Design a protein around this ligand. Sequence first.
Ligand SMILES: [NH3+]CCc1ccccc1
Ligand SMILES: [NH3+]CCc1ccccc1
Ligand SMILES: [Cu+2]
Ligand SMILES: [Cu+2]
Ligand code: NA
Ligand code: NA
Lengths: 621, 621
Amino acid sequence: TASPFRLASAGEISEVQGILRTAGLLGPEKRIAYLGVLDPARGAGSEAEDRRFRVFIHDVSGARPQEVTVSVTNGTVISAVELDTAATGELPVLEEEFEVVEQLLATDERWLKALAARNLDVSKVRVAPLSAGVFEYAEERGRRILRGLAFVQDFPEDSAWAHPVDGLVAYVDVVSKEVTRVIDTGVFPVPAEHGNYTDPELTGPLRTTQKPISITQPEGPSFTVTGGNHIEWEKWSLDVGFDVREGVVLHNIAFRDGDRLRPIINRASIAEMVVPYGDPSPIRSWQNYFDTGEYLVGQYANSLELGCDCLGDITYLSPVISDAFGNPREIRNGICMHEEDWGILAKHSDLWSGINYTRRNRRMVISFFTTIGNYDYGFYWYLYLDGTIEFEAKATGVVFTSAFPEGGSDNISQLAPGLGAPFHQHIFSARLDMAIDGFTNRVEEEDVVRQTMGPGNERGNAFSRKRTVLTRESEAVREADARTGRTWIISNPESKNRLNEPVGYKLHAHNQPTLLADPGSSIARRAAFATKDLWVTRYADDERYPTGDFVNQHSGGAGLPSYIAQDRDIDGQDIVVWHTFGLTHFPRVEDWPIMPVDTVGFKLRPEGFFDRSPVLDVPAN
Amino acid sequence: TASPFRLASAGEISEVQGILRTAGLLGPEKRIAYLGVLDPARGAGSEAEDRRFRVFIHDVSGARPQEVTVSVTNGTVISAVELDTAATGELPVLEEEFEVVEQLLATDERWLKALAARNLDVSKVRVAPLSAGVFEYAEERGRRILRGLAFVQDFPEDSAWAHPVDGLVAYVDVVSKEVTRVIDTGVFPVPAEHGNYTDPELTGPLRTTQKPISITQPEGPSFTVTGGNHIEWEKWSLDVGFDVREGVVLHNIAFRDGDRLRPIINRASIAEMVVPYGDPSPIRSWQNYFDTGEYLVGQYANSLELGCDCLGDITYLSPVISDAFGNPREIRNGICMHEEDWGILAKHSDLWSGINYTRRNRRMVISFFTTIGNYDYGFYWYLYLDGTIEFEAKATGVVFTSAFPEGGSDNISQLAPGLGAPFHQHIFSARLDMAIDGFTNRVEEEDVVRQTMGPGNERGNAFSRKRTVLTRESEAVREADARTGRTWIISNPESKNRLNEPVGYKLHAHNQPTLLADPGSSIARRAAFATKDLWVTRYADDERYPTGDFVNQHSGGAGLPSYIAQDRDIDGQDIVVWHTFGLTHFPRVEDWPIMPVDTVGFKLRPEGFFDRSPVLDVPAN
Ligand SMILES: [NH3+]CCc1ccccc1
Ligand SMILES: [NH3+]CCc1ccccc1
Ligand SMILES: [Cu+2]
Ligand SMILES: [Cu+2]
Ligand code: NA
Ligand code: NA
């Protein structure tokens, strides 16, 4: 029978559109802001498939938006409810709104006055469509607002990011098509130099010194793809999903240990990311973009070109999403899958036995790349031969710019003459619905323990470890402690290895700084997840995002801080780990005019999950 | 003219032997415990080469050892001094002593009594030749001692590590050939299971699922090697050295930025490593092995097999060292050099300009692998296209074992029935003699700064950075602070980029735990470097190792804590950064019977060193 974890197909999306149409929910004034398949319910699979899709529907004529779930299998509406967005949050930004901010401002007298003072041709002024957040403007409550920051393009192929127009910001109601405010705090020179990284004047002559590196697989890859998205590779099994909000998600990560298929992670995703800015200028002090929750990173996934984006023997998935009208849209070559050599796996040359042994490692890679305005991110999941699981985000694109003030700044870096880059962070939340050997799991926080020289430790060399079980959600909001080697172990207290110890996996964080904003800020309330490194909740099918379902213009407190208050039992239960991890970015000159990739991530390693090394059966190369 | 940074050649070593012989310093009772070329003096190179070699000479007849420097160019002894080892430390362990401990014990009545009580055939009992340290045994002061721990080999190809003989340790004087102590604290069962990772009974049938991954370079590599060890690759220039103590060392790391060859690091090496054990049992509580300083990791560098150890288009160096008699000995294929693809370098798809841009990264890799008893380590240096420099250590081999006590342990992990693995750390010191744009350098510690919501930061979003210059050595012993994003910037205060800011590089640590032992322990005094993450000293040619020159059986306080007390000026001077970084290892079942690689390291990234991205001239793939 068909797997309930298969990717949405074009025909399923069309059937959703048809169901909504027949139900009276998708007339010509409606736009789909989000649409995605839902995961099967726990315990389903008893020969009764029910593929459900969830949809957020916007109305361009001013009516209230709706959240709808349909059964594509049964042709039915499961639920449909109108949303009061002043309470629940606005819907995600629509792609069609990316152009609207500039269009509305181009005929506004106040905007034109600001541009004329600066001798800027309106036809050359791009306006970034920036999420608004919630600040002191009471008139915005319940309205769908974007804010606009201007960047000059000297010609149509020019990089506008080189030419920010500082001192100017505008706010627009994208439904009533009105400009609510135009704030001009003062003229700043528009930085003069271009940032055109394909112009020979700036690149100089291209180097001719790189000789080819050829990666091939003469017998093809060692993984198989069946059922469209089910991967089998080197003992691992999983399904690769794709959601317009989250991007690539991994389901049913399991490892075949002899004859048993042993679950490890039920669902892995990046359930939110946020980019908070640290410049106190009123032109930018409101800026915090939730690329996942506000913009939907899957929607903007790039088509990945062979030889350029993914090198070697690549197998692609081309996931389908909905356009704004409910028609299917394929993202051609949007997901790369391939295996890579990964150096030495294990090596020992033994003087006493005379045996010399070396084995090589490899990893399975599942990745996509997305672009939301100036920034571009690659999301990479890795599975290693030895049972390690890793995620890595690769941040690149063009840094968000400003003017560089006269006389310097404590909150902005200089990149070029007169050109600044405000300080900011990129903070991710990985939602790991755990299933270590099945669903009965618990988390322990493990710290190194230093011991005092004295009785029982007379030479002062001993050290130890302590593990603390997180028993209820009230105790499951944790912070890093790099100095004490803090990690978190997810174990199954009812499944023991051959040494009579509970099987587990250990989460190794990078221990980067968490959200720096003041705890009384709007962003600290709207991105509360980002203030702590590790959260553990009891699984609930509707607790999907650490920021809640409607992030755009939500006033704060949604998501994890609300979920956790239920104080549910997490000691040997079906649980979800939410790991916050991020990059703090004080931009450097080398990041301009296009940023070399920088990375952040985390990994999980088996910890007494196996009865011995799981890679003793790897052959000599 | 010949480069003074070239590798030692066989003929140079023979000439050292000849000079020592003619000078009366290398008769038949002498053994060379260490021999290596010295680096050129600052300001040399004025058409007056003087290749000097330093030698530590042991005497098997009981005479005092000597430290000698010769000029191989001039055929002269520069200096020769007898060492009082009770003050200065003993010489490094000799390879010929690896067999001596077992040999001496095999005829000792007390050792035979201990083995007979356990029904162990002496012919099957291997004895590890373990460094002694300095504890409470006054009779050891000034004597060359090794300690012995026993492991049974059931047959000559058996992995003895599976069969530790706990409760038993012996101490031997390897010069007088006497057994000073045999301590038998009680019988423990010798763990029964084997650990033979090539036995099909334990591996099971080898997997047949791995299909080949072929990495080739049809036009050869993009780097050149001239003068034996001078590398030019993708703007980088450096010389690859090899010392019997440190292993691979990198000299004169520089980057060609347009027409200027800009120095970055004058010398990079791993100047010490130490493995302290955290089991308070008297059988092991003395155990701390300084693989670099006591054993000499270069001496044990492996010959690296193509296709197995180094994959792709590999260029090898085969460095020469001295045997115990001063004859040259080549380590065939001991150093791998190759370039690797490294994913995406930079990527942006711009809605407004319509330009889609992707470039790939690559890295140059210079590596070696070494084996000292049970453990094997790979040392990898990486140079990236974008100016980043990285080091990574890969730890593998077989974990050091013990019995697993009845009734468990706070300081030992269980690996198999009755088989334990004592807790321990692997702690490295990278000595980075800096030369950021030349030798006039300084270090700043940079922390993130959180800001309070209030006047000038009304939305509570601002955050900043603070840099503190380390002005003198008295202020240059620093610890990590992961929570505040702490890094260290090495800059040249007299060399500014085009934006009028000092050029620099930023050191990014992993912020792993430092030495856990009590501060009053012997190991905390002998490995004081390991107690703090970052030290900065003023360059001095004789300050080579963070532990001093003679680590074996030195009583404490040598090296960095002594150097730093000079309180020299480091604010715009020729300085050396010593970064401590390590892995804390609570062994897991998966580490047995042979350990999958685990890693630790650090990286340095340019920080306003360049005037813009240094990779704009990279072509499309
Ligand atoms: N990344 C979401 C914010 C954004 C959207 C469009 C242009 C610039 C920035
Ligand atoms: N690694 C240095 C210590 C050592 C030496 C020989 C056998 C086992 C351990
Ligand atoms: Cu950034
Ligand atoms: Cu270890
Ligand atoms: Na779960
Ligand atoms: Na220096």
